[PDB]
Ligand binder design. Structure first.
Ligand SMILES: [Cl-]
Ligand code: NA
Length: 240
């Protein structure tokens, strides 16, 4: 997250860190949202590589013992069947991870609430992106979870020529684009949390930023629209 602030330890308990084994250590690569005690929702492009992955729930600082983490291996991966890694603009950037163990819930570990199917936020709806992604374009990952306030940009505006043009689809949510704050590499797969009727719900799964930079004016962060996949999610969990 570029232009973010440090999140309080218990603000976003459904946020997880998706990590891969690197030598004798684990490296954060993407965020995710805990949606069942043994299921995580993340971006399909985060699991394109055939690596060993683990999820960390109750994570706040990637580099220091928080006293609250639960480390759980990824046992099964279900990528959306229409995902194509060389066509992120087509959409379908979503995948579900079944965990090897069911995590224990508490104030640092909770399930993310998803929006009702088909829900589309009005332009400029207030939302927060959260993640440990780069804090600057071509920078480094954050040590502590960051949050940034990114209002939605509706399809009509987001798909206009000065914004994302034909690249954005109605199956995505755009947010931000002010040139100061945005998601960045390493935030992919994580949540876009938006307050609706007094409750936050996870409306987006971070998918991509501009090749020209993370925080680029009129290039809002683009997320997979969670509300377009409610039936898909329910169907995968019911058959797995
Ligand atoms: Cl949360
Ligand atoms: Na930690």
């Amino acid at each position: 997250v570029v232009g973010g602030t440090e999140a309080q330890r218990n603000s976003w308990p459904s946020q997880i860190s998706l990590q891969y084994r690197s030598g004798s250590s684990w490296a954060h690569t993407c965020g995710g949202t805990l949606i069942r005690q043994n299921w995580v929702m993340t971006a399909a492009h985060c699991v394109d590589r055939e690596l060993t992955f683990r999820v960390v729930v109750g994570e706040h600082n990637l580099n220091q013992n928080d006293g609250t983490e639960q480390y759980v291996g990824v046992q099964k991966i279900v990528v959306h069947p229409y995902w194509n890694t060389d066509d992120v603009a087509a959409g379908y950037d979503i995948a579900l991870l079944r965990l090897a163990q069911s995590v224990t819930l508490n104030s640092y570990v909770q399930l993310g609430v998803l929006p009702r199917a088909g829900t589309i936020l009005a332009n400029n709806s207030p939302c927060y992106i959260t993640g440990w992604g780069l804090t600057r374009t071509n920078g480094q990952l954050a040590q502590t979870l960051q949050q940034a306030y990114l209002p939605t940009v509706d399809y009509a505006i987001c798909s206009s020529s000065s914004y994302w043009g034909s690249t954005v689809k109605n199956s995505m949510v755009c947010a931000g684009g002010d040139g100061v704050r945005s998601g960045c590499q390493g935030d992919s797969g994580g949540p876009l949390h938006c307050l609706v009727n007094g409750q936050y719900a996870v409306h987006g799964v971070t998918s991509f930023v501009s090749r020209l930079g993370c925080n680029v004016t009129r290039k809002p962060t683009v997320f997979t629209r969670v509300s377009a996949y409610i039936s898909w999610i329910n169907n995968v969990i019911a058959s797995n």
